[PDB]
Every structure is written in structure tokens, then in C-alpha cells.
Amino acid sequence: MYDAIVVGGGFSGLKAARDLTNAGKKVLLLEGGERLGGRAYSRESRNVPGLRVEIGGAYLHRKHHPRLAAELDRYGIPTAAASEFTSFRHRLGPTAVDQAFPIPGSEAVAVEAATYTLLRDAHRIDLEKGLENQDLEDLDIPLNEYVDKLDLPPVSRQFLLAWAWNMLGQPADQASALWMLQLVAAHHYSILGVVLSLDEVFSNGSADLVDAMSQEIPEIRLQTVVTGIDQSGDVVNVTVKDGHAFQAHSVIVATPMNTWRRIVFTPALPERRRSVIEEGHGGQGLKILIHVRGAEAGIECVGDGIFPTLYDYCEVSESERLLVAFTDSGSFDPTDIGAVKDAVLYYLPEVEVLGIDYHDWIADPLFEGPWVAPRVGQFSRVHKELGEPAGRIHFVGSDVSLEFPGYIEGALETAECAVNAILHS
Amino acid sequence: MYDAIVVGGGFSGLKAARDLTNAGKKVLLLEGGERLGGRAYSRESRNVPGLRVEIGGAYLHRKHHPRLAAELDRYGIPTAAASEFTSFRHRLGPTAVDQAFPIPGSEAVAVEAATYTLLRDAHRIDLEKGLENQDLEDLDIPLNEYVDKLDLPPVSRQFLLAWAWNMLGQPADQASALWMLQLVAAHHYSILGVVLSLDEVFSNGSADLVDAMSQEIPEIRLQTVVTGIDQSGDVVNVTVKDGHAFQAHSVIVATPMNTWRRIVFTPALPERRRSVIEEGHGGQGLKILIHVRGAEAGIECVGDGIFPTLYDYCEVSESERLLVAFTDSGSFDPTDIGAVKDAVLYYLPEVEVLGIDYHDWIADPLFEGPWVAPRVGQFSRVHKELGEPAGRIHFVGSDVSLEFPGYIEGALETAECAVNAILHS
Ligand SMILES: Cc1cc2nc3c(=O)[nH]c(=O)nc-3n(C[C@H](O)[C@H](O)[C@H](O)COP(=O)(O)OP(=O)(O)OC[C@H]3O[C@@H](n4cnc5c(N)ncnc54)[C@H](O)[C@@H]3O)c2cc1C
Ligand SMILES: Cc1cc2nc3c(=O)[nH]c(=O)nc-3n(C[C@H](O)[C@H](O)[C@H](O)COP(=O)(O)OP(=O)(O)OC[C@H]3O[C@@H](n4cnc5c(N)ncnc54)[C@H](O)[C@@H]3O)c2cc1C
Ligand SMILES: CNCCCC(=O)c1ccc(O)nc1
Ligand SMILES: CNCCCC(=O)c1ccc(O)nc1
Ligand SMILES: CN1CCC[C@H]1c1ccc(O)nc1
Ligand SMILES: CN1CCC[C@H]1c1ccc(O)nc1
């Protein structure tokens, strides 16, 4: 039996396990899959032999993501930007300008005013309290309704909606305004910052950091799916799909929120958590790597397409590239390549699609979703509580970060807190 | 004897006189100078025979200035923009972009944040209450100190300071932050709007409108300088530099604030007004028309020069133009043409200065100043009170507008209110 069992071998689990180990605790890490890293998943391209790609989490910004920056410095892990953006091919209407910030002068006043309104609203959020504890319910409404009250002209309206679609992984009618404002608050109260945090990538893949961290973790079991966590006795018992149990004084749940509902907790989790847990969050983010021919380097496209964003990812050859598109899996079927072709040619009518690569995170039983985003009304009912301990079971992960939810940084942050909580008695 | 005497034949006096006349009152307008229009002064160029120029007020924006827009529609008075701006020659440092909005991407986050801060502060101002009645004293500090707390990077910092210098007619150390915020509030809570209200000009000069209005005013005396206003009796007595008095039930003071201190009021004006009146406001605006050779059309220059702004005004010929520069008369001596040459060549090293035209508003005894701007600390002590009646004497004018101070629109607004006050008993 162990001081602590960590369930899940993403960045959160890995951090918690390593740090508890270095503190002299006896730790076991159980990972249900065949690999470590979770929603950070670098691997060989399905389309391009010998090419390493990120199929989940990839981007970081050292200034918004200091714990991650610390990890990188700690292990000497190189980063860079994946591409310079120099060619802008927007679909925002005839008055848009082809630049990174495509808003024309005739919209400037409208943007100014909306900027003030969004940031005012964002400043209502205190990041330590939880979204359900601050009288923020009036903001917990469908994003499209919120944006309708800003009454933006066409370019700025579509620009904001596109990036919101991209970033939340939900269409505007399903996204919560409060959640959009949450991401603005997490970026030091900045709208710009949300998109500007796409700043660098791992030069050798996320696996670089995953492997570094795992090297400091003495006991790991892969292919070990936790099905049960029972703290009815003096010591927590963790049952596993095989049926061969492990015991510890403390258990860290570092699996995705949308998979909690498949674990049997004993006793049952506190009742106010239960409904949201059963439902799951509404995240439907979809990231598609697109192998193309005839694309110039450095393309960025933002617009009103079924892909709100489409931008440069990497050089394959003199004539071939990968692009990345974001949409959501409720709106778009990535296995309909004809659809892919249509969505790309909308922005880039000269380009030929050669193929696509993605991971169906929502269909994967180890995840049941991409990154976190609430359904409308969820997190103004319960949010902080999701990542609070239930007796000796701690809940960590990006999904439950108050400080940086949906980011690698949030995984690290939450791990920090569980480790400290465990070290204090 | 008259229902009303109006003192001053600027837009405020003219409006008040006309409207009282049309209401069936018996009105006399006394103007101390040889012309009507006051600080709106179109006349022939000192530099270019046969050319009409604006030596004071010139610019308007129909959307911010609806009363003025009404006047223009009423008399069929044509307007246009004086020039397209197409060539940007800024002195804002090597990272500036040569566009109307010269802020580069690396400053975007900083600007976003400052935008929120300025507008938040501006939203503290309710435009009907007066700046001395709202607990705004913490904002009534030197602009440079306020701007230092925004901690802007270099381009945005200098850009904001330049336009503030231009617009307030005061260097940053003498300008009040609260007053800058007042102009932001007057423009429907917009920073951009302050500069965007430079939108059209009178196609035939301000005198077009002045002449239209004066045609509706049956009794006008020019060269009649008021020296005394005495309401100790039942009927107000207005003494005049000649010594030949006029009497009325009501008197409208529509002369500039900085000339009130030369009038003998009986009884004395209410005591809390007296000190600011004696001191005068701190407006030192200076507008210089510059006759040039070798300038391309459509130039706008903003920067850190002794002229914060320098921009296109009109075509004289294929090789000659007028530009306009704003600075202030405490900082700059317009009769030092060598200085003028230096200030222009800073932005435009290829251009030859042929000559200059301006009016020394501060030296003119009928004005003692250009447009209104408070000294630091003035208007958070007394501001609304300056434009309130003292018994039967009303105070109007741009100088005292709560709603649009320093603009033609403010002259019209204040006249509106005095007329209505007089019509009601
Ligand atoms: C398409 C996509 C793109 C992204 N892009 C970015 C980005 O650019 N930048 C950024 O910062 N973030 C990005 N993210 C978000 C980020 O990758 C995740 O928030 C983060 O990796 C989550 O780490 P974690 O430790 O919370 O959970 P995960 O990485 O999900 O780890 C959970 C672990 O639990 C395991 N598991 C599940 N059920 C069980 C079970 N019952 N028993 C045992 N193990 C179990 C899973 O196998 C997994 O290894 C992206 C996410 C996705 C899906
Ligand atoms: C250089 C400059 C540029 C400007 N640019 C713009 C601009 O682009 N757009 C804009 O909207 N505004 C502009 N303004 C501000 C605007 O012109 C004025 O606020 C407005 O014209 C003031 O009108 P008024 O009726 O309040 O006062 P004024 O126009 O000053 O009228 C005052 C009248 O009082 C007379 N007078 C003074 N003392 C006496 C006395 N004792 N007895 C009898 N008569 C007396 C004066 O002769 C004058 O005719 C500018 C002002 C200046 C100086
Ligand atoms: C840099 N600004 C462009 C807007 C989006 C963005 O910043 C971005 C997008 C992709 C990428 O790899 N790097 C940056
Ligand atoms: C249009 N934007 C440029 C900034 C200043 C400005 O708007 C301006 C200046 C002079 C003029 O005649 N018209 C407009
Ligand atoms: C930065 N975020 C965190 C969750 C999804 C991810 C992401 C990355 C790139 C992009 O264009 N949009 C979203
Ligand atoms: C618009 N304002 C009102 C008072 C001064 C005037 C003005 C006009 C043009 C310019 O560039 N700056 C200031």
C-alpha cells in the first residue's frame, strides 16, 4: 500500500506523482492507456511518414503559463513558434483588412466600446472563488445572445465569434458567455491575450516533457483502468478493470472530468457535484491537421466558415504543408473529406487537400471529450466544488482549474494544489 | 429697454439672441469687436491672397454635434472634409506604423488594458452634474502623472500624449487628467471619438453660418464693449465702454470665461466662482496655419515634436499647401519662424516653410484665451456653478458647457439652456 495513488498519466497526474515522490512519499501512478501524456499527444503523422505532430495540446505562452515555463527550464526542453504568420486570407467580408487584426477603421469605435464592456464583465470574475460563488448567473447565457447585446458590426462580430468558436470548441449557441469571460480573466484580463497565448510549441513534441517527467516517477502502471474508488475504510481502495486492487492513504483523480461518471465512488460524491458529473461538460473542440498542396507558407485564415480558423502548422516539402483547423465535433464530421475540402477551399480556393489527421477525443473512452467547456448554466451552479477533495480523494486536472482551465497550465496548477494539500497532513 | 441683452456675438450669443427673438422677445445683442463669430473666425489668408481660412474653430462631426448639424441643415450650409489623409509621417519611434492608428502589435495588449482603464475612469463622469459635484478630485491631477500610472509603451504613450497636447492646448504637466476624461465622456464615452470628431469643415467658412444666424437678429451693436452689469435695481443695467448704457430684464453673458474678470458685476458674483474667474482657465491652445512648398497631399504627422500634430489643411497650388499645426502658446512662439521651420522639418525634412498665419487669442482683449481647459484642480472645485445664473444674469458659452466644452456644439448647447430658462418666467 502507498501514501498516494494517482489516477491518470497526463501532465496533472505526472506532476502530482513526481512531486509527491520527491517529497519522500510512496506513490503509485495508474494510467488506463498505453501511453503517458493524455490530451497532450505527440506522435507520427497519419499522412506524412517520419513527421511528428501534435494531435492534442501543443501551444503555450511562457508569460501566461509560468508553471509550464518552469517545467521546460527544469528539463532543458526546447520550444519555438511553429510558423511565422505572414499571409492573411480571411473570410470576414469585403471591408476586412488582410492582417492579423483585420478590423477596419470604420469599426474602431464599436470595438473600443465592446472592449470596455467585455473587460468590465470579465473583471467581475475573481479567479479564486469559483464561478458558482460570485453572482455571475446573469452572464451564464448563450454566447450568441451575449454577443447580440454588444451589437458589433460585421467584421469585428465575426472575428470575435470565430475565435470564440475555435477557443471554446463550441458553436456560439451552445457556448456560455461567462466561460468566454473566464478565459479572458485567466489571461490577466485580456481579450487579445487569449489568441496571443498561441505563442510557442515543443520543438520535439509534448512527449519530450512527458518523458522527462515520467523518468522521475518510480512506479507506473499502464493499461490499468480504474473502475472504483472506495474510501469507506481507513485506507482508500482502488479497484481496477482486471479486478486487482491497490490501496493508499490518499487518492488523486487526475482523469478527465467527463470520465468520472464511469468510476464507482464509495461513498458517493457530494450531491451537488453529481448532476454535472453525470452530464459532463459540453466541450466539443475538434482539431484537424490537414495535409495540403499548393499552400503558401505562413497562412492564417479567420472567418465565418465551418472552420472558423485555419492556419499554418508546418512545412512538409516545397509544395506540401500541414495546416490546422479548429471547429467542433457537433458541427463537423472530419471523416467526410468532401466536407473538409469544401471548408478549406472556402478560405483557400487554390489549395488541394491530400489528407487529414485527428483524434476523436469524444469517442475515446479514456477521455469522452477534448478540453473543458461548460454547457450553459453548468458552472454558475457548480464549479469550484468539482475540484475540491471529497474526504481523501482529490480531483485535479485542466478540466477543473480555476486559474487556467482547458490549458496545460491548468493541469499543472491543480496538481500543485493537491500535492500541497496532501503534504499538509 | 429690452426683454434681454445678449453680451457677445459668437455662436452662443447669436443662438440665444435669435431664439429669444423668434420667441417674440425684444432682444439686443452687444458685440465688443468689429465682427460676429468670436472664436469661430474665417477670413482671408495672411499668406495666400484670395484664400479663405479658419483661424479658430473649424471642425465638426454631425453625430457628436447634433445642434450644430441642425443649424447647418436649417440654413442649407455646405460642409465637407478639408482633406483625405493618406500619407503618415509620424515621429513615434522606429516600431511605429505609418498609418492613422500607428500602434504596433507588440503594444496591443498594453493598449487594450489602458483603453479599459481610461474608459472606466471616464464612466465616473456624469455629464449633467458638474465636475465639482462627483467626488472626482482623485482624477484632477496633472495628465503626465495620470499617464505615468498607465505605464504605456513608447508608441502608444507618445501617441496619446501628442493628441492630448493638441486637443487640450496644454502640455502634459499642466493639463488635468479629469479634463481629458471629460472630453472622452463628451464623445459618448470614447477615446477614439475625440480625434474622430475632426470630421468635416464649413465649405465656405464658419462665416456662412454666422451670417445666416445674424440675419435673423434685428438689433446688433458692434464695437460695443460691456464693462459693467448691475442687477441691483429692478431692471438690469449694462454699462458700456463709451459710457452709454442699456437696460433689460435679463442679461446673457456670452463672452469668453477669461474676460469675465474685466466686467464689473453688481452685486458681485457668488463667492465660490470668484477665484476661478479671477484666475481664468489654463487653455493655451495654439493653431498655426503653415504655408508650405514641397509637401505631398494628405499628410498627417503625429509625434513627440514641439508640434505634437501637423496635418494637411488645403491645396494652394500644384506645389504649395497649407498645413495646420497645434501646440500651445506657453511652449511655442509662433513669431519665431526659425522655430516653426525646425518644428515642421522634424516631421517633414523635405518641406519648405513659406509663412505662417494665426491669431494670438490669448493676447486679444476680447478673448484672453483660446478654447477652455482648466488648470489642475480648478474644475473639481467649481465648474457647473460657472454656467449657472446669478439672479437675472445667465452665463453661456462653450467655455461653460457641461456637455460639450471647448466645442462649437457647447456654445449652442449652453445657449439652448439660457433661452429655455428665460422663456420659463
Ligand atoms: C485537441 C486538443 C488541443 C489542445 N490544445 C492545447 C494547447 O494548444 N495548449 C494547451 O495548453 N492545452 C491544449 N489542450 C488542453 C490540454 O491538452 C489538456 O487540458 C491537458 O493535457 C489535460 O491534462 P490532464 O492531466 O488534466 O488530463 P489528460 O491529459 O486528459 O490526462 C488524463 C489521463 O487519464 C487517463 N484515464 C482516463 N480514465 C482513466 C481511468 N478510469 N483509469 C486510469 N486512467 C484513466 C487517460 O488515459 C489520461 O492519460 C488541448 C486539448 C485537446 C483535446
Ligand atoms: C484656435 C481655436 C480652434 C478651435 N477649433 C475648433 C474646432 O475645430 N471645432 C470646434 O467645435 N470648436 C473649435 N474651437 C472652439 C470654438 O471655436 C469656441 O468654443 C466657440 O466658437 C466659442 O463660442 P462662444 O459663443 O462661446 O464664444 P466666442 O466665439 O468667444 O464669442 C465671444 C464674443 O464675446 C465678445 N466679447 C468679449 N468681451 C466682450 C465684452 N466685454 N463686451 C462685448 N462683447 C465682448 C468677443 O468679441 C466674441 O465675439 C476652436 C477655438 C480656437 C480658439
Ligand atoms: C499572432 N497572431 C495571429 C492570431 C493567431 C495567432 O497568434 C497564432 C496562430 C497560430 C500560431 O501558430 N501562432 C500564432
Ligand atoms: C481620420 N483620422 C486621422 C486622425 C486625425 C483625423 O482624423 C483628422 C485630422 C485632420 C482632418 O482634417 N481630418 C481628420
Ligand atoms: C489554447 N487552447 C486551450 C484548449 C484548446 C487550445 C487551442 C489551441 C490552438 C487554437 O487555435 N485554439 C485552441
Ligand atoms: C476640436 N477642438 C475643440 C477645441 C480645439 C479643436 C481642435 C481642432 C483640431 C485639432 O487638431 N485639435 C483641436
Which element (helix H / strand E) includes B292? strand B285-293
Q: Cell 500651445 appears where?
A: B328
CB distance B408 to B57 below 8 Å: yes
Closest residue (by CA) to atom 7 of ligand 6? B167
Cell numbers linked to A359: 483524434
Three cell numbers at A113?
466600446
Query: How many other C-beta atoms lie within 10 A of the C-beta of residue B81?
Result: 12
- Contact, A196 vs B110, CB < 8 A? no
Q: Which three cell numbers stand for residue A118?
A: 467585455
What the block records as the C-alpha cell of A302 is 479567420
Phi-psi region of A167 (alpha: psi -120 to 50; beta: other; left: phi over 0): alpha
Assigned C-alpha cell, A90 = 480571411
**Cα(A303)–Cα(A162) distance, integer angstroms:** 6
Atom of ligand 1 nearest to the CA of A33: 47
- Contact: B192, A120; criterion CB under 8 Å: no
Set of chain A residues whose Cβ sits within 8 Å of the Cβ of B100? 105
What's the CA gap between B44 and A132, in Å, rounded? 68
**Which residues in B lie closer than 8 A to residue A191 (C-beta atoms)?**
112
**In this structure, is the dihedral angle defined by the CA atoms of residues B200, B204, B209 and B212, taken in order, positive or negative?**
negative
Cα–Cα dist A137/A271, whole Å? 21
Identify the three-state secondary structure at position B5.
strand
Q: How far apart are CA B202 and CA B208, in angstroms?
A: 8
| Cα distances (angstroms) measured from residue A138 to each of A148, A381, B85, B117, B330 | 15, 12, 44, 24, 52
Lateral strand order in the sheet of A299-302: A87-88, A299-302, A309-315, A320-328, A285-293, A352-357
What CA dihedral angle connects B102, B107, B109 and B112, to 10 degrees? Answer: -30
Burial B237-250, CB ≥16 within 10 A → b, else e = bbbbeeeeebbbbb
Separation of A39 CA from ligand 1 center, angstroms? 3
Query: Which DSSP helix (H) or strand (E) runs through B327?
Result: strand B320-328
Q: Whose CA is nearest to atom 29 of ligand 2?
A: B38
Q: What atom of ligand 2 comes closest to residue B255's alpha carbon?
A: 34
Nearest CA to ligand 3 atom 1: A196
From the list B107, B48, B134, B137, the residue with the least C-alpha distance to B319 is B48
Give all domains of chain A, ordered by start, each with its CATH number: 1-82+198-280+372-425 (3.50.50.60), 83-197+281-371 (3.90.660.10)
Q: Residue B135: exposed, middle, or buried by beta-carbon count in 10 A (0-12, 13-18, 19+)?
A: exposed
Closest atom of ligand 3 to A313 CA is 12
Backbone angles phi, psi at B276, to 5 degrees: -60, -40
A112 interaction partners in chain B (CB closer than 8 Å) = 115, 119, 190-192
Q: How far apart are CA B160 and CA A299, in angstroms?
A: 33
Report the distance separating Cα A267 and Cα A229, nearest Å. Answer: 9
C-alpha cell at A148: 447580440
| CA atoms within 13 Å, Cβ hemisphere of B366 | 22
**Closest C-alpha among A311, A328, A321 to residue A354:** A321
Instruction: Please name which ligand lies nearest the alpha carbon of B196.
Output: 4
Name, in order, each residue with C-beta under 8 angstroms of B235's C-beta and a sequence gap of 6 or more.
Answer: B1, B247, B248, B249
For residue B387, give the H/E element and its range: none
CA-closest candidate to residue B269, choices B382, B368, B415, B413: B382
Q: B134 is written with which cell numbers?
A: 462627483
Residues A303, A306, A312, A316, CA torsion sign: negative
Cα B324 from Cα B287, distance rounded (Å): 7
3-state secondary structure of B2: strand
Residue B183 CB burial class (10 angstroms; 0-12, 13-18, ≥19): buried
A193 touches B at CB < 8 Å: yes
Instruction: Output the 3-class SS for chain A.
Output: CEEEEEECCCHHHHHHHHHHHHCCCCEEEECCCCCCCCCCCEEECCCCCCCEEECCCCEECCCCCHHHHHHHHHHCCCEECCCCCCEECCECCCCCCCCCCCCCHHHHHHHHHHHHHHHHHHCCCCCCCCCCCCCCHHHCCEHHHHHHHHCCCHHHHHHHHHHHHHHHCCCCCCCEHHHHHHHHHHCCCCHHHHHHCCCEEECCCCHHHHHHHHCCCCCEECCCCEEEEECCCCCEEEEECCCCCEEEEEEEECCCHHHHHHCEEECCCCHHHHHHHHHCCCCCEEEEEEEEECCCCCEEEEECCCCCEEEEEEECCCCEEEEEEEEECCCCCCCCHHHHHHHHHHHCCCCEEEEEECCCCCCCCCCCCCCCCCCCCHHHHCCCHHHCCECCEEECCHHHCCCCCCCHHHHHHHHHHHHHHHHCC
Instruction: Please check whether residue B359 is in contact with residue B41, taking contact to mean a CB–CB distance below 8 angstroms.
Output: yes
Task: Give the pairing of strands B52-54 and B42-44.
Answer: antiparallel
- Residue B85 CB burial class (10 angstroms; 0-12, 13-18, ≥19): middle
Q: Half-sphere exposure (CA, 13 Å, Cβ side) for A250?
A: 22
At residue B343's C-alpha, the angle toward residues B337 and B349, to 5°, is 105
Enclosing H/E stretch for B323? strand B320-328
Q: A141 to chain B nearest CA, in Å?
A: 23
Contact A403, A413 (CB under 8 A): yes
Start-end of H helices in B257-359: 271-279, 337-347
Q: Give the number of other CB atoms < 10 A from CB of residue A12.
A: 31
Does B262 show up as a binding residue in the annotation? no
C-alpha cell at A6: 494517482
| 3-class state of residue B231 by DSSP | coil
